[PDB]
Design a protein around this ligand. Sequence first.
Ligand SMILES: Nc1nc2c(ncn2[C@@H]2O[C@H](COP(=O)(O)OP(=O)(O)OP(=O)(O)O)[C@@H](O)[C@H]2O)c(=O)[nH]1
Ligand SMILES: Nc1ncnc2c1ncn2[C@@H]1O[C@H](COP(=O)(O)OP(=O)(O)CP(=O)(O)O)[C@@H](O)[C@H]1O
Ligand SMILES: COc1cc(-c2ccnc3cc(-c4ccc(C)cc4)nn23)cc(OC)c1OC
Ligand SMILES: Nc1nc2c(ncn2[C@@H]2O[C@H](COP(=O)(O)OP(=O)(O)O)[C@@H](O)[C@H]2O)c(=O)[nH]1
Ligand SMILES: [Ca+2]
Ligand SMILES: [Ca+2]
Ligand SMILES: [Ca+2]
Ligand SMILES: [Cl-]
Ligand SMILES: [Mg+2]
Ligand SMILES: [Mg+2]
Ligand SMILES: [Mg+2]
Ligand SMILES: [Mg+2]
Lengths: 440, 54, 351, 424
Amino acid sequence: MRECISIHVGQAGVQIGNACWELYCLEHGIQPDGQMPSDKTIGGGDDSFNTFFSETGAGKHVPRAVFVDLEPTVIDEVRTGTYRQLFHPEQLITGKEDAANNYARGHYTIGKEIIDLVLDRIRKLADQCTGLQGFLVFHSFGGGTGSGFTSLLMERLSVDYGKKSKLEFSIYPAPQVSTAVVEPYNSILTTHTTLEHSDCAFMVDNEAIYDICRRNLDIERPTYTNLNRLISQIVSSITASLRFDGALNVDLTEFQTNLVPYPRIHFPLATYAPVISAEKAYHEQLSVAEITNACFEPANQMVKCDPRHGKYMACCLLYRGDVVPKDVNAAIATIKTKRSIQFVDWCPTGFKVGINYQPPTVVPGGDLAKVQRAVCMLSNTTAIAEAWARLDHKFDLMYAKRAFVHWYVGEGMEEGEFSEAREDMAALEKDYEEVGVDSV
Amino acid sequence: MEVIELNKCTSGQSFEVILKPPSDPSLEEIQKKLEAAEERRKYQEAELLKHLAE
Amino acid sequence: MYTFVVRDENSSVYAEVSRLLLATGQWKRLRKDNPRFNLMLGERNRLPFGRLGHEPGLVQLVNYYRGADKLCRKASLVKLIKTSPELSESCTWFPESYVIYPTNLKTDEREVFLAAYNRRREGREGNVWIAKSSEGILISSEASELLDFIDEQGQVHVIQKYLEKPLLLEPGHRKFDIRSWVLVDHLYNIYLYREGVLRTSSEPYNSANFQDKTCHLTNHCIQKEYSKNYGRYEEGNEMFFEEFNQYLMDALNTTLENSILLQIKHIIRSCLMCIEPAISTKHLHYQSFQLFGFDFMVDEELKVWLIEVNGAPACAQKLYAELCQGIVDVAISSVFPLTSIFIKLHHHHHH
Amino acid sequence: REIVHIQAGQCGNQIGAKFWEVISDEHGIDPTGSYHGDSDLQLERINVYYNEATGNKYVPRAILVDLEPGTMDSVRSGPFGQIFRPDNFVFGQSGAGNNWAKGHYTEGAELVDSVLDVVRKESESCDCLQGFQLTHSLGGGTGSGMGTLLISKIREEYPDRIMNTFSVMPSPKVSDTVVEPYNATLSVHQLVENTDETYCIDNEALYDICFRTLKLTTPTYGDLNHLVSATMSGVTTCLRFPGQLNADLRKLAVNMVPFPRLHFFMPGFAPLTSRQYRALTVPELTQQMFDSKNMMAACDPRHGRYLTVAAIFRGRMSMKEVDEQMLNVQNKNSSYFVEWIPNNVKTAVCDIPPRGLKMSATFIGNSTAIQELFKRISEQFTAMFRRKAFLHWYTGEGMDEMEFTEAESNMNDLVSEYQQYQDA
Ligand SMILES: Nc1nc2c(ncn2[C@@H]2O[C@H](COP(=O)(O)OP(=O)(O)OP(=O)(O)O)[C@@H](O)[C@H]2O)c(=O)[nH]1
Ligand SMILES: Nc1ncnc2c1ncn2[C@@H]1O[C@H](COP(=O)(O)OP(=O)(O)CP(=O)(O)O)[C@@H](O)[C@H]1O
Ligand SMILES: COc1cc(-c2ccnc3cc(-c4ccc(C)cc4)nn23)cc(OC)c1OC
Ligand SMILES: Nc1nc2c(ncn2[C@@H]2O[C@H](COP(=O)(O)OP(=O)(O)O)[C@@H](O)[C@H]2O)c(=O)[nH]1
Ligand SMILES: [Ca+2]
Ligand SMILES: [Ca+2]
Ligand SMILES: [Ca+2]
Ligand SMILES: [Cl-]
Ligand SMILES: [Mg+2]
Ligand SMILES: [Mg+2]
Ligand SMILES: [Mg+2]
Ligand SMILES: [Mg+2]
């Protein structure tokens, strides 16, 4: 058994972290005060759930988590909320002035004065770890903390823990939800500074999650908690193989081996089916074939784009519920005949499959109906580069007039970091186009 | 369509199906970058306080 | 008030649809790079499909199908036909065709190609070929010469069977090709425009010297220039369907629909239904339509051959008005509301 | 969190007083500072504008400044006069005679340090001060001249807080003296340099609204100030009520101000109210709030382009309908928003409506059309300055013509900078 520390930065990372840990507790049968009746070896262990929870002599099961916000109001609601008991006060870290949607303010100005405190609170968790594999980092692209502080954190984690893997869960900005006009700047800036410190990153476009809640959950104006419980299901699908017995994606390094052959192109597309409303009176349960097929509709992807006009490098299916291998291969067979699924020449056209027999657990009073089988697909397709094209184009429009630039320079950032970051992104877009398109 | 390295346990199964075969900077470099920005800030503040003194 | 932007100004047909849309009084043109449009009439190359369908509160529609270029480039079409099971190696309406990469670039069929050539040489069959790509065309029965010529130009070229016995219209003993305009809407309805055209040669067809290429190449450009008899029999070297129908009735005792059109509608249907899973926008966050130009040849036994599909066609001058009104009707106002000039191509045989 | 409010001069104090009257009545706090509402949302951000007192009375974090005692005696006598901390009344005795120079250089200098002492004692009492707001006019002497002197001193002592002003622009239609274009031009230069966001309230626009659409035939300063209270309440909604959006000026400034000197916002309000019963639909709120006739700055939005926009809807309504209506002015008038700032319109909503309305909308536009306000002030200025007319009132207090020439150059620059981005 090897432990994993989750790091939640900014509002988006904290409120999503709350969503995840709520779900993890429901899944492992841990209650809000940290007690796990089914855990029969009291005060210690090395089961697979122990990679995420640690144990105290009194029988409390404690997330291997640090929450970090440069302003207190969001983590205060953790400290006062229904899971107050579960986290040690030392794992909730607040500033008092936030980064005002400004990458430079979170990285340089407010970053410098809190980075050492965070690294030592991170180190207090790493010290109760007999074997650490590395980190899960939750953050928004568009926030000033989520973007600027995270990239500073990511740089130093590489130094202080250079043999450990670092995975991110990144909220990509979407005007239907988004908080700010400068979020394209913050996104490009922090992707450029984090690109080499991140081994594999799962992007969630707030636009895709929003529309899934409107169309499939009949929520006409989705809240953050709507958005986050759905994001939480998908994250828990992705992490279940670290918390549960199995042989696929058993540690963080397998995530890069299985999903990232080229290390810069480390943005797997997540697709998830089915999302069913709990208010749906009469619902016909969907089959293995139907939910595997739903993995290839764009309307179910965490990032709207079109995988038909790209190439795959890797592909996992993670099933939860009543699924058996024979039905997967029958579903896969029928799908490859009816759909454009082309791989890059230097990879096998194939699927790594993982099944866990316990179906998704749903938060009581949530918006998701309980289902008998679900699947989350993780496909490293070059079509995700569409999201970089979108982001980069918005960045180009504003920076051509230096709009808002003065806010960043005023924090001590130099204008040239903008153009460096944007040139890195220019490379990244061409890497994607090299791998994933052949000549016109 | 080959179905390979099947693994079972009470929690679930895992395997691999193949349809077709193939055809970092320093700590000191970081806190220097952080201090160079801090001085660019403290300079622009001194330029303001000098202007306000004029 | 719907909104639209124009990003191909060198487009005869969408120039006219732009003006037809303004005249409605319900469409406003924005500037090229304004993102708040309902409709994009976009560029031919590098059209930024990845940026469509992400504007909250805006149904967006573009006049091109992403991926539809695998039908409209000569090398791709060949590769599509022989690799797709619905079209087949065993495809009766496509001329034998082989992709050939030049020597500088070093898949490629060139040695599978002359298998067919020498099987024809010692088979004593007529064996003229034609080399082409996506003006630099050579028609010769010396295989030894055509792989000569492909490699001194630097682009990938396809070599295709030459149709040595084409149907020839009299008076003239002269070649032609047929161009049909088909519209695929956002619902993937396939609409054939009821008017086609015959792009005539006005030179009698000479089967003994293919090095002169003006009785062999029916392109409106080459006839406008090289041929001494441009404008001789038909206005603009363009024959329309009413004439070509009655010529077939008088000269050959059939009609256009029975002799040729059934075969054309079968080829259009088969090509677009093949690539439909790859380009459909049915469940996508933006929508596509596209106007295509299909080009056919008729041999003397009245068999129709597909020679190429063009994804950005110009229209014939007389027809611009009616086709372009038709595009607005069924491609644009179908999505943005304010007897048909199209034949819907649908067939569902049971087996 | 906490904001320190400052109101300077005759106009700054009258509008300031009715602002505090209006928002104190929203938050349930009565004239003696005693709370008496029925919801806890009235109290959740009450600290942004109020200190909690002995007996948990609520006292405005407000300093009242004048160079004469007339108007502030009127405030102490006024409806909510006793709400204010009496130590926060700072006044001289001789007035400023509608003279910028007296406000900024002579009479004002004598009293500015005693104002800064009360500022300091109000910031030290602040858990985490985020910045200041000043209400003043630019056409007189105290609020114009001393007000901008105070803004300069406050920046010196707090260079990293947000400075925010509600600035009444002078108009010949509502005019106290001929020298207003001089006082306004001197003040605008200070504002370009030393504030993060300035709400341009044009007495011209407040008059025309009062006349053309409220059909008040003889508008008083009281009628003008009703409009000013209503839109000040509206723009400060996020600072005072719980919402998705936190109560901080810095995020607003960052998202509204693409270039630092272009921070002069055109405010707007709907429905336009004089001191009725019809339900206003969400499509109507939206159409009006963007209507030129609802702008408090007498500029025509269709003469310029919106760099950024913030909009604040108040009441019980469907934010799906709000979302739809906002998306449909931007998508049906995309001409008038710069294409080089994507998604430059932000919309916020608050459940609690203002007194007397079930639904209101407040508009905050950073339009390049605001140049028209500055060119108007500039033409009036030049018409006197080319004859050095009325200058003696200023050279008498130490000023030189050079300082006028510099101030008019700076405003003409500001107008050119607006025009550069209306063509970009
Ligand atoms: N899915 C989801 N997105 C969020 C959430 N909170 C914010 N976002 C999005 O993240 C971006 C804003 O970033 P934040 O995380 O709030 O910024 P921050 O990290 O708190 O940084 P500062 O507040 O600027 O110090 C916007 O695009 C939001 O739509 C959340 O809880 N769930
Ligand atoms: N295998 C073949 N057999 C007989 N004739 C052929 C032929 N291939 C091409 N042609 C003739 O050459 C002419 C044009 O060839 P090509 O397919 O390259 O069209 P093109 O792209 O150059 C102009 P457009 O796009 O308008 O059709 C045809 O009209 C036809 O007369
Ligand atoms: C919307 O009105 C208000 C908004 C805010 C606020 C809080 C936190 N983040 C943000 C982002 C933006 C924004 C503004 C414009 C654009 C184009 C994009 C984004 N505004 N904003 C504060 C407020 O208090 C004073 C407020 O009232 C005026
Ligand atoms: N809307 C409004 N404008 C005012 C008011 N009082 C003065 N003004 C304007 O303010 C200018 C004179 O400023 P004033 O406040 O009397 O000067 P000060 O007291 O010396 O700062 C002129 O433009 C007046 O029209 C008021 O109460 N409401
Ligand atoms: Ca245990
Ligand atoms: Ca590393
Ligand atoms: Ca004196
Ligand atoms: Cl290490
Ligand atoms: Mg925050
Ligand atoms: Mg062509
Ligand atoms: Mg006065
Ligand atoms: Mg003193």
